Design a protein around this ligand. Structure first.
Ligand code: 98Z
Ligand code: 98Z
Ligand code: CA
Ligand code: CA
Lengths: 110, 115
């Protein structure tokens, strides 16, 4: 699956590999799911259809550790994507990373 | 003008007017303390958030209220807000502009930092 995250690197022109991603649900922010992106920049298996209910969620991507592992100077502490989950749907949260910028979009399909 | 925020609307090709922006600063006990807030002008700009004296080193969070912006235009958006979190002033004072470009299911942000 219901929730997937995909992260891309705009400097190197590649998937962003081995990035830590934490997901929280709003209760204060309670930990819900986490993982590290794969060689393709994707993180699957975060949750299940049963666990992923409507509500407010935050996806926190540890962009600062990523850029430090590449020896590139970053601006942000992390990137955070906060959204409301409201028929049948799959959510992809995608992010494109640069040292002083990031962009995010949601892909929501049936 | 050590901290400025600029917001644009990618659907209408316009400044994003009357957008609420809240700034927080991380406290010693690791919670977020209110720091400053304001609303964007007719030009999409928000100046006058803070001063050189109040804008000390720290970890700051700028929360731009994109959900209320879209709902006022009659649109149901995906995100609650757009957030930017960064360490400021670590090597002395700098001037920061935080810019954001909005669509209903997407946003992008960039920082422009000058000495
Ligand atoms: N994945 C992803 C993206 C997030 N923002 C973009 C901008 C251009 C192309 C791809 C994406
Ligand atoms: N303002 C602003 C922006 C935030 N992200 C951008 C991407 C392209 C052009 C402008 C902006
Ligand atoms: Ca879990
Ligand atoms: Ca310092």
């Amino acid at each position: 699956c219901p929730l997937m995250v995909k992260v891309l690197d705009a400097v190197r022109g590649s998937p962003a590999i081995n990035v830590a991603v934490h997901v929280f649900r709003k209760a204060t922010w309670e930990p819900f799911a986490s993982g590290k992106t794969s060689e393709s920049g994707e993180l699957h298996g975060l949750t299940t259809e049963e666990e992923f209910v409507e509500g407010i969620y935050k996806v926190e991507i540890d962009t600062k550790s990523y850029w430090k592992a590449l020896g590139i100077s970053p601006f942000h502490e992390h990137a955070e994507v906060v959204f409301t989950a409201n028929g049948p749907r799959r959510y992809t949260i995608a992010a494109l990373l640069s040292p002083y910028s990031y962009s995010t979009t949601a892909v929501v399909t049936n």
